[PDB]
Symmetry: D2
Subunit: 327 residues, 4 copies
Amino acid sequence: DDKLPNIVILATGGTIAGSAATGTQTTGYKIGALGVDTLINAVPEVKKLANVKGEQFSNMASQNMTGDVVLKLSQRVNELLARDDVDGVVITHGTDTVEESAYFLHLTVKSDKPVVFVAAMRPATAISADGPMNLLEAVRVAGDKQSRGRGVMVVLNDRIGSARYITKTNASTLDTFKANEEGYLGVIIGNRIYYQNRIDKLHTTRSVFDVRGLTSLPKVDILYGYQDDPEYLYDAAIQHGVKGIVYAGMGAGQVSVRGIAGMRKAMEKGVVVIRSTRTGNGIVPPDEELPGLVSDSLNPAHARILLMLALTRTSDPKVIQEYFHTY
Amino acid sequence: DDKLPNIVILATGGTIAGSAATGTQTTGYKIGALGVDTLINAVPEVKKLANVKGEQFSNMASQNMTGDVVLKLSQRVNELLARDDVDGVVITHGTDTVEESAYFLHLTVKSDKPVVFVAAMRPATAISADGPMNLLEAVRVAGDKQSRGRGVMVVLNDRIGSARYITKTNASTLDTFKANEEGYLGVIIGNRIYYQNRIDKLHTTRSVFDVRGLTSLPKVDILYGYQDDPEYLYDAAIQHGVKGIVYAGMGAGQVSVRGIAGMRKAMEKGVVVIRSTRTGNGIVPPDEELPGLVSDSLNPAHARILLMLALTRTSDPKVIQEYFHTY
Amino acid sequence: DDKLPNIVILATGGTIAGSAATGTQTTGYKIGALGVDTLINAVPEVKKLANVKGEQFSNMASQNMTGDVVLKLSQRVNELLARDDVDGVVITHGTDTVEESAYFLHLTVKSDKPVVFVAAMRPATAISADGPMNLLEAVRVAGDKQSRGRGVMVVLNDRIGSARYITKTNASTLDTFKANEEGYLGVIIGNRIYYQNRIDKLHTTRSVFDVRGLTSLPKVDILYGYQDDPEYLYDAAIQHGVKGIVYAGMGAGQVSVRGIAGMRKAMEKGVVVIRSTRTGNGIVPPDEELPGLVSDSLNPAHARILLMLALTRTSDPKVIQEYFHTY
Amino acid sequence: IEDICLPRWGCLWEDDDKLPNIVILATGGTIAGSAATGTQTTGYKIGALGVDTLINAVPEVKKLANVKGEQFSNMASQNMTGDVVLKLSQRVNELLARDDVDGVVITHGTDTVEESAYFLHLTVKSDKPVVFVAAMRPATAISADGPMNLLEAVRVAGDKQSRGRGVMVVLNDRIGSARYITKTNASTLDTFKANEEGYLGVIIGNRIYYQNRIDKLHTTRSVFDVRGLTSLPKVDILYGYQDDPEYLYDAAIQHGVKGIVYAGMGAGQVSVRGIAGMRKAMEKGVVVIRSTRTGNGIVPPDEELPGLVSDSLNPAHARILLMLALTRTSDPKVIQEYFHTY
Ligand SMILES: N[C@@H](CC(=O)O)C(=O)O
Ligand SMILES: N[C@@H](CC(=O)O)C(=O)O
Ligand SMILES: N[C@@H](CC(=O)O)C(=O)O
Ligand SMILES: N[C@@H](CC(=O)O)C(=O)O
């Protein structure tokens, strides 16, 4: 059908491809059993929105997704979007770390063609499974000419989230993906896309980051901030050769006497520290009296992705801080 | 005034007692400078709601609050509420770890008399500083007969939050304290309290946790869940003699192959592992195929407080799990 | 099965019983064709939670639900719950006016046995239809001993809302039912109920409202507040014999000079005016300088239901105002 | 920084040529509310407190901009009317056409700021910032929000990065688009939210963080031009609920409405009584927009129901767009397209 857009569904795994013995097992199920062609054939309506081709990239639970594999995913998506016969890509993924994978591609995909991550909170075998409609919506978004140049998108539950703002806010609910302060890029209601916002940040074709032919990324750990937080976790990260530490800080990236000592020690060894927040939302503002750089509105998981990519380009703290304010 | 309730304002510090040279310095200000009587004298209207007595317990930024000091704060509040001449206590505290301090007292205060934490996101010297109205509302709540038996409360921005549900959701905003799934116990509008909910959990006078005569707490650290999370941080926590690890997990407390190896090592050494969530909200459901216990709807910071108190009474994982479902 | 609770599924219609020719059709689906037994047979797992009996009360779209029919629904539920062989009732209903029907039964059901409204945003024939899981959850809640004495409940999307607080917040999304300030009474995750709150309001067995003998209810209309709102709509309501007007006011029930003239004319004719808010949330506080009574945190649709019932018990404005603060 | 006001001339711009020139155009609201005590948060006076008193309460504003106050009105916003909003739009267009004006901050009541702001969003023919500001507590309250909201509004209006964003509403450290922002709570400081669309930006630690640009037509790309108008079409809003009466449609028709916005049950759904009323209105040439009472989200098209659909416009916003649509057209296809694009 020469009228329809050509969409690759690049499958990585996740609960959307999860399988249990009964419709009420929504916890305990298997990931690794359902191939992309089985997902496509379960929603043949997708074939009215696009010419779809399935490609099996991986079949893992996203809690096991690693930077080396995300780097390969970015490289594969770039190869697909460089082709004239590909109009967009839908990536099926686990909900747990989709925000990390999506934000990585948001910074590194060198195309305006749509890249739409899709996931499901209930396994494919569940009663009222959300994956079928999420996939149909993701294909609609990936295939729409109006979807171009918006950055990487995450589509669940009738919502289109920017990779830069969207986060899994709830352990277990269908409506978990929200950006409380930034909203959705758009919504899909009655089989129509309603675009609301364009993000005011650099991404994709206007991003400086290009990691095509890297094979590995700088090591970055995330340490939590809390009452009685110990210095020894900084020491352990330093001893294992981290290049960056993201701090999931108390309030606005605020630091105890232990965190301060740990950050100062790490920076003396050339580790870059980003102060983010454990709160879930909002701005960590600059404070020249505290060590490290600040995460802007990046949450810890997003901040780690940006810091890893920043460290491939520079060790200059002024340049890295500007990336945190612009990406 | 024999008609008015007797309320002790027990000051611990925080931005509510923060001081800067200008009204627009909302970052960089000093905590440790402003005493409880200066806070009281800035809102003399409080003296129409109650007979207030200030007591200076500490004067620190709450990112420096520690379990030994929270233990002493619980002990002091228990001794104040045991007195016939005290009808309730307001505790001024920093926003960054108020949810940790408040939840600890929620579990350990053996009185139905109101205990109301209050804080401010802007320093006392700021333009449109929030601390004055927060304090007046906190005194109104602490003094109201209808406030008894509700568990420990956190009052900011016209809202009354339960210590068990309320969390700082935003690094930097006035409206940061929310319980997205559980709502507020009540609101204060037009100088009137509107009670909405009673928490359906054990607390205060129905809690088994009694720490009168304890001098220290079990060591519990929090490790974050993310792509490429390292096993070596579990090794470090084990080597430093932690009694508990709270895991700020991916999604519903989900664990990488590295986290699973770390948790299995910890449990072999007698460490109790609680799987919570980094997401900010919702339920980590039981899963007998994964290591450790589950945090129910307790976020990581709250889960650490309950685990520390649980470990003062038991090492039995069945009892600790039941505490996580009932407190 | 003598172990299982006896639950009646009392069907009234709604999108949960909507049927279309294709899985993607969102408009011109049919309500009125799909019987309660077809809903039950689509989720046979419900038979493992309860002994279910289907009863067809009606089969309409809830935008067509009327006070005369809600009155009969209340009467039928009271008749069912008076029976020893009924442990609870699930009521299938349209989403559009479930908050009006549910709040009416919340005030008029004279039993502590659970009454659980359930609904679906997608038709039964839709891809990823929500009705099956919503119904299974509603039966789990209605059958649980812990669910007794909580007031009337609305269950969708893994959430249990109080009839007094829950509202349809979004025209079109699955997660539409929320109580932004009051939260959910509980959630259902992994086939387990997590109760969070008990509402701090009068309902059911502690309510003064009893309609078992009534055959009609007082007339109450709702007028909107907005720039240039016309006096003539007050005149029209008065000429058509309303006994009450609920005002969906600007901000905190605020009134233009035209609305004030209309309200004064209505009150001169014995019409009771309740000032609610168009905003969606929060308290309309008392103000003796404005006409009428205030809705507390009741939104316009809920305020109308309470005013209709209040008018069966009193014409005293002091008593009606107290009802708005206590129900 | 000293107000220099000369005779038979008026007040001068501070010389500071580094700073933007910002007009603070005052209309009233609780931000200009005054009571006898700090705890009177209902019962206070609006109409007594002038724009220079607001400016003098936050002299820090003079470090962000050269500010000139202009008193446009001094009313509670529940009394704001389309004829006054029309004049406000025309005055803002006159100010922004001047080379010596870099932006305008408009002080207003919270209750109908979303209506006034959206009207100007469609009718202001400039990329220069227009920032509505309001306060939920009176100027005399303990922890009054108006001072910081005004300082934030001036910072936004003066920033070169603020241009071309549409009309903005600034309270409580947030920058909302006029098209999405609404008063969501009767009484709270954090009432202004756009649950599905978020904020355009936030102001934290004296810095603006821009997050979003709205993907809708506004200001310099809007077809709505009301310069030269002295009158606007009549549009009423009717609520949808169980037992909603047909007679309120009859009353609106008899009073010559050109439009009806329906605050519908769920997705603009209509009872048999509402359908009969809407059919009667449309037979008389009244344009009907089906919006939602819910507070959020999309009313989708449905050829089987009467009227047009509001898209994601809430009833108050839908009334403003319908009134402006009816200045230019009665074509339902054109009006529907406006609802999808504005
Ligand atoms: N653990 C699963 C969760 C999900 O997809 O919902 C994953 O992220 O792969
Ligand atoms: N760092 C401060 C922040 C605040 O109180 O707002 C504290 O927690 O003490
Ligand atoms: N119009 C339908 C909508 C739904 O149930 O979702 C009804 O309320 O009956
Ligand atoms: N009634 C006031 C309320 C406020 O400004 O907060 C107004 O809209 O003018």
